[PDB]
Symmetry: C5
């Protein structure tokens, strides 16, 4: 049978997961920047 439709589906699923990855990474950078600033203001340092 024709595997093109399934190939398109795999690509669509790839983009779905990749979009989730982008959102996670985006949040993570925010958490890391917050961690950085907090450490910068650590009196012990």
């Amino acid at each position: 049978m024709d595997l093109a439709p399934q190939m398109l589906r795999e690509l669509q699923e790839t983009n779905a997961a990749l979009q989730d990855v982008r959102e996670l990474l985006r949040q993570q950078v925010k958490e890391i920047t917050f961690l950085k600033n907090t450490v910068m203001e650590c009196d012990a340092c």
Copy 2:
């Protein structure tokens, strides 16, 4: 026809890896978020 069978296989393996990457990132941001909270409550700071 064409290398459709082979290309599909590469796409499926890629999706499987991306899904794992997604879950790894998910867990990672969690750990970072915990680390962040632990530092915010660190009396040394």
Copy 3:
């Protein structure tokens, strides 16, 4: 139905997503690098 047109759009979307992922990772490495150096010169250490 020729699916090439749709597949191409998926590939383009993938690259756009990756461009964002790369930019985010680039900024994240900079934050971590700064966090590293800050902890390195921490008084209480």
Copy 4:
């Protein structure tokens, strides 16, 4: 088959790169978890 052979090779290269990204991320999570436990079990905090 036209550019099919070349496209398949790009896909294989992509899967190889992803495997490496996965292994790197798996190592990174372990370092973050250790870091998390370290700060969590810190005395000064």
Copy 5:
């Protein structure tokens, strides 16, 4: 309009982008590891 040529270019771009991601990730793991060790040798803890 034959889209294969353009599809090949997108795939090659995905690999170029992924190589950049892998490069950034390996450097990031190094920075995170340095951070981990630095905290481990931090007297304050």
